[PDB]
Design a protein that fits this description.
Blueprint lengths: L13 E4 L4 E4 L21
Antiparallel strand pairs: 1-2
PDB class: cytokine receptor
Keywords: cytokine, cysteine-rich domain
Assembly: monomeric
Amino acid sequence: GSPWSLSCRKEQGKFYDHLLRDCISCASICGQHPKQCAYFCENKLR
């Protein structure tokens, strides 16, 4: 269905950035990440 197939899982939490077409993490960008990674370090959680 979706284009989510070339993603990579190095840690427990991660995500796929379309605009980048690559697999980006959420913990590595804590504090300066999109809304998708809000569940890691943001109002959604912290």
